[PDB]
Symmetry: C3
Subunit: 432 residues, 3 copies
């Protein structure tokens, strides 16, 4: 039952990549992934399964292998019954093949092959999930220069499968897409765009279990990822100490070479694609790294995996844990402030927040910031420094002094007349 993924890795100098971590009925973590000796298309990809036992990743079981065919990404995860699903596209044919296991990785059975039909290919990718009576494996497809996002579905526990809901069909090459039931009909999705270049991930939402979809635009935070290459998004659902739900997005930035997460209030995500929080690095991701996946414990505790290259032809799985702390129920942008002014922030909360923090920085993208508390200094006349705070059932209001921060009276960081700032930026956080 408890887990510890800090520092854990599966690495045997293969090219192990493109897979999913999930958890077995018996609480054991496992990985299903493509094991190969190259990444190039038409190389030696086989679908394999490894279980984490005693802190050691097991010698992998072969799920599916065919000379001379090349299995690509491995999609799947654990169904409600405890059956495991693994699905992978055969590079040579564009067909998706689906395997299941009822003994938890020991034996595998081929259940289904999806033919291309008129499509150039169907590409299986990502964590599979339950939607009502249906279990879903996400696919992306191209047909010349039309592109589609689709679900491959089973309503009988994996015995039979079929093309189902269609999420997108258009001229934009959306591909690797993570879907998160959030639920009672609501499904959120975040998609890689083409090569990933451009600094954007696309956000879609359905309110009817995949029946219909709205394109909500690009995932948007105050401080983005420039035009960086962004790939393989993955999503998790958590809720706070008092029941507030948030969505957590992991993604890999191949320009800065880091895997990051950001969060958003589910309420905001339902409303649109803006309101995501600041990026937090959870792992270095050199070169062609990572392809994240998560298991969540206690509605609170994210266990993660990505893949990382040690060279252009070798890679392994590296696990980690995400420590979210207490996610604010309300959080402002960094916003500009001036002296002797009044700032009024609608908090949008079900009750007045019992806790509030106000912080100060000299830009809206700071690397350091100060806690704002109402002080005083004297420069010839009497002056307040910082902010007083009023809380109520609608608003947080801030009243700034002659300086919005700083006094000159405190060592190192506030030790001269020059640290008395008449202007800058505040950020307000509030917790119910």
């Amino acid at each position: 039952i408890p887990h510890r993924l800090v520092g854990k890795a599966l690495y045997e100098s293969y090219y192990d990549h493109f897979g999913q971590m999930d958890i077995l009925s018996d609480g054991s973590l496992y990985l299903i992934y493509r094991r190969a000796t190259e990444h190039v298309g038409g190389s030696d990809g086989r679908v394999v399964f490894s279980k984490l036992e005693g802190g050691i990743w097991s010698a992998p079981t072969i799920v599916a292998q065919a000379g001379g065919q090349d299995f690509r990404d491995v999609a799947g995860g654990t169904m409600p019954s405890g059956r495991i699903v693994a699905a992978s596209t055969v590079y040579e044919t564009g067909e998706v093949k689906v395997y299941v296991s009822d003994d938890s990785g020991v034996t595998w059975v081929h259940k289904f092959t999806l033919a291309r039909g008129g499509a150039d290919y169907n590409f299986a990718h990502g964590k599979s999930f339950q939607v009502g009576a249906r279990y879903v494996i996400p696919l992306y497809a191209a047909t010349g220069v039309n592109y589609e996002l689709k679900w491959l579905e089973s309503s009988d526990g994996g015995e039979t499968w079929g093309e189902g809901s269609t999420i997108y069909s258009g001229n934009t090459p959306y591909n690797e897409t993570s879907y998160l039931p959030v639920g009672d009909g609501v499904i959120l999705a975040v998609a890689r765009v083409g090569s990933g270049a451009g600094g954007a991930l696309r956000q879609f939402i359905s309110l009817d279990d995949g029946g219909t979809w709205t394109d909500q635009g690009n995932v948007t935070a105050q401080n983005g990822d420039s035009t960086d290459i962004l790939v393989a998004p993955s999503l998790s659902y958590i809720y706070s100490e008092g029941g507030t739900p948030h969505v957590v997005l992991l993604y890999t930035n191949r320009t800065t070479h880091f895997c990051y997460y950001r969060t958003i209030l589910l309420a905001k995500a339902v409303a649109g694609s803006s309101g995501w929080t600041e990026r937090v690095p959870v792992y270095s991701a050199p070169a062609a790294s990572g392809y994240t996946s998560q298991v969540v414990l206690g509605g609170r505790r994210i266990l993660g995996n990505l893949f990382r290259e040690t060279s252009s032809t070798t890679s392994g799985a590296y696990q980690f844990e995400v420590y979210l702390g207490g996610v604010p129920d309300f959080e402002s942008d960094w916003f500009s402030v001036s002296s002797n002014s009044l700032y009024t922030l609608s908090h949008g909360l079900q009750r007045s927040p019992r806790r509030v923090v106000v912080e100060f920085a000299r830009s809206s993208s700071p690397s350091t910031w100060n806690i704002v508390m109402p002080s005083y200094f004297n420069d010839g006349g009497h002056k307040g420094s910082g902010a007083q705070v009023e809380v109520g059932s609608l608003n947080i209001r801030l009243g700034t002094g002659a300086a919005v921060w700083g006094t000159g009276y405190f060592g190192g960081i506030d030790n001269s007349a020059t640290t008395r700032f008449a202007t800058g930026y505040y950020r307000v956080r509030a917790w119910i």
Copy 2:
């Protein structure tokens, strides 16, 4: 597994009311309720079941209907076995009829009818619950001008039933009563009083699984509900990020037309009926609304339902979520404070609180309040403003300045000599 009830409703222009929301073994939420085309006694009430699937409340299954009889409130919920129980009083006969389902709302079986005996009637109402080996459906009864609160019990998983524990018997018409196992023998109860007029809900407690009961008096907070009509209380159990248990009370105020909750530390509730916190509105409740019920996830996350009228003859179920945030382990009343004084608050905590907030208002029923932090102003002489704080293993102590709040140095809310307050009110909150 995840749920989202924000904005959800079951409304088909019937008079749907007086029911319970609970959760099925498979994680599906459901409602059992009285569906009719009127509210008046002797109209067309039938007991019905609806399941929430894909974000859509299902066309209801008929649980029990009889021309020309009128089923009234629907009590019940999910037993430990996954069997569902629905019970309702027949208006014409005063008899309670009990139905169960073993396939989760699809089929229903009549298990029991309770005859009046010497009582004018037995009235089934509320969420049923497990007490040790017993499953309980709450009843209220009248016999002329004697009134009783009783439990209808089964010790064989719902196969057979019988009158059990008697909670109250006297001249006061206590009726709609919610019971919450809190547990190892401790059961809390909160009861509507007569019509509900008077602004009071009555609190009872047993320490022996219903064997004996103590009347603890009226539910009491610092700021009550005047003489308002208070109806249909319902209770939930949660525990904080570090294991502190609280009880959450939902109720409908038909004078202000809002459904509210308040909370109390379980430790306080065991000790008596005072110590409840401030009311928080979770839903408008026009006219003859609501009849709340809850499901709790992760010890933390309350999912709720009430019924609301759209007219005197039409009503629906409306769901919501409660965001408790981090409930304080210690919380004072608003209490009066003066300048240059020392306030000593026994926190009652198992260890010194790691976090403390002090807030200030000009009345003990404020709509806005300020965060108290030790500042300074000069009005001819040197003066502290606000409070310094000492924490220890017994007490929080506050030392007030020449002003208990205010300086005149901060925009909007603290911008004149007039905002330098020598007196007012403080509230202290503390979190372990």
Copy 3:
């Protein structure tokens, strides 16, 4: 499902002691323990089981009794299957006898006896636990003046048993040892040393499910237990509101006569034996008290038991609950500070902490402390009092004023020139 252990006790004027509390499949708490009419070796110890039902500890079932033999400590707990295990050393023979129950305390079956072999004895003690496919009962042994810590293991669900991993073998009489899977191969252990005198408990860790062990030294906090008698340690695993794992250590101090807990970040515990937090008393422990054990709910909520003497020949089980609050993700020692200085604290956190508290005391072992916020006073010239704070992704930095705390302007606790402190101690806490 909910539990309430506040004030609960099992006491019948026997000498009831040396046992374990755990929880049954059906959510019922139970105790397995030695019931006797004396504590002396060779008296009348029998292994017994009691279940908590309706808030009342049941008349105990006899698990194992033999005239004229004396069962000593009772080790065990609940296996993953729901089978209960109870094991106890027979004083006269030094043999360990193992019993199981498949009906949850009603019937017991003897499964195994461990002969001494060359050992003076094997002594069963503590909460048993699962390690992968193995279930473990801890033993300590002596062979003249060699001492060993060992695991008695079953890999078939308790049907057969055998000596397994050896944790320690040497000249130091480590004995009562608690083991906590933390997991994926990581097991922490804390051990009583000999009689317990000396103020120390010893910390060991394995990273390979008991294959190998490292002695990490004495459990170390800033403020220890002098040379006190420390006995019967026991360990629990919890995780914070955002997934940060901590270990909680309970132990009994027979010099001060209190049962205490301390906590440590799992990350710190893996790194070594220092970093434990301050002791918190959870129960008086007169004379030869207590022998703690815990059940944890929701990753958050510790339910506890110890045994307490009412005289040299009578004792009972007393239960309690531990309220951890929000455990800091980072916490400094009390460290010395001076005026007009800059303190730089590496927080070690995955992201910048959203919340920080700074407190002040005049020693590094204070009984009271003050919250530090940047104020002002004038003693002829302008002076800051307290500290300003900078937060970033690596460090918390504090800048102190001319006084590190105090102004003379606030009633009771800060009301004279004498409370303007140029030096003292700060403690910083941070929560992600």
